Amino acid sequence: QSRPASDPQVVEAARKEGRLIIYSSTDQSSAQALLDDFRKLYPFIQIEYNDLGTQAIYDRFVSETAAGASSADLLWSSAMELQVKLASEGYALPYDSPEAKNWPANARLGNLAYSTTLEPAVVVYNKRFLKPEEVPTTREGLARLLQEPRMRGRVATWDPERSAVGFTILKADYDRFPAFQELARAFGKAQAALYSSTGAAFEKVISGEHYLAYGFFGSYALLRQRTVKDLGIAYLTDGTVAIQRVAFINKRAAHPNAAKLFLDYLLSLRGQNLMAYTALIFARRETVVGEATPQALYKAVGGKDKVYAIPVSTEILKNLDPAERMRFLTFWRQAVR
Numbered sequence: 632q633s634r635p636a637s638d639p640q641v642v643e644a645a646r647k648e649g650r651l652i653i654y655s656s657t658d659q660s661s662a663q664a665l666l667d668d669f670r671k672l673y674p675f676i677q678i679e680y681n682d683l684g685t686q687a688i689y690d691r692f693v694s695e696t697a698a699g700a701s702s703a704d705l706l707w708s709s710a711m712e713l714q715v716k717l718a719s720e721g722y723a724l725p726y727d728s729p730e731a732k733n734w735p736a737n738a739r740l741g742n743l744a745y746s747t748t749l750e751p752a753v754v755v756y757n758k759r760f761l762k763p764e765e766v767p768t769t770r771e772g773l774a775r776l777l778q779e780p781r782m783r784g785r786v787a788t789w790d791p792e793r794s795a796v797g798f799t800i801l802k803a804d805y806d807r808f809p810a811f812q813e814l815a816r817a818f819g820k821a822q823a824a825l826y827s828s829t830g831a832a833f834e835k836v837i838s839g840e841h842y843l844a845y846g847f848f849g850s851y852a853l854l855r856q857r858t859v860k861d862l863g864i865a866y867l868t869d870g871t872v873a874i875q876r877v878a879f880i881n882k883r884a885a886h887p888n889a890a891k892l893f894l895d896y897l898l899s900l901r902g903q904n905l906m907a908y909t910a911l912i913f914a915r916r917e918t919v920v921g922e923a924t925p926q927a928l929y930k931a932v933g934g935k936d937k938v939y940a941i942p943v944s945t946e947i948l949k950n951l952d953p954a955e956r957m958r959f960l961t962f963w964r965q966a967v968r
């Protein structure tokens with residue numbers, strides 16, 4: 632492919648920095664090919680990739696900043712509310728990425744933070760327990776399946792009280808899809824187990840302890856499928872929540888220029904193509920080729936109209952308002968117990 636269009640003076644300043652600290656919720660097993668390809672472009676950048684939980688990224692970054700400590704150069708996290716909160720509160724370096732000129736307004740927070748992905752919340756299942764034909768592709772259908780005695784104890788979904796991105800996804804589902812309330816009651820009926828990481832849910836599904844998991848990232852499911860033939864993916868045809876993994880540069884980065892190079896790389900055709908084709912991370916750009924693409928998602932759900940892309944906007948900070956959080960979690964807690 633190409634090289635990202637970062638200014639040659641940023642490249643020279645990144646070479647004097649020589650180092651890049653990343654705090655990321657992107658599982659290293661998915662991120663690795665992007666780190667490897669970024670090092671081929673810029674081998675003089677020593678990367679410290681910190682694979683961390685979404686809430687752990689926000690708590691660590693805020694304390695280290697409060698203490699005047701060494702923190703990250705770049706934060707990359709699926710917990711969209713916590714990224715937007717930081718980037719709208721003075722923590723972000725303002726930077727107009729020359730790779731984001733065609734980003735729509737709802738995929739960027741001006742010059743403070745950026746969408747890097749369009750990642751669907753999907754259904755995964757174990758083909759030894761559920762044939763593809765048995766797996767409903769709507770919230771109503773899934774709620775009916777979860778009335779079956781045989782499904783009791785055989786469902787996984789997020790714990791929105793322990794995963795900040797589990798909150799992002801289930802809260803967006805709750806806000807947009809009336810059918811979600813009926814589904815959440817069916818989670819209660821089926822005694823759903825609640826997980827705070829995708830791999831923990833997936834291993835239960837792979838072992839057959841659960842037959843089906845709702846709401847986890849299509850990205851991770853596609854990569855896991857390469858080595859697990861019995862892992863099925865179903866896309867919701869009544870409406871799919873998509874998260875946009877948000878990246879921003881630490882205003883107090885020790886290596887701002889190295890962080891600019893990495894952000895430009897993530898947004899570039901080269902980076903987005905590597906996401907779609909090799910990392911199997913569902914890319915933001917619609918001009919990418921591979922399995923993990925907007926066009927493959929749109930085809931699976933029956934069109935772009937059936938995707939609800941959570942915007943990279945301070946409007947989503949509504950979800951952290953105390954009364955709003957209380958309404959959703961009081962509903963959730965009652966439905967699922």
Ligand SMILES: [Mg+2]
Binds near residue numbers: 656657658683
């Ligand atoms: Mg992760």
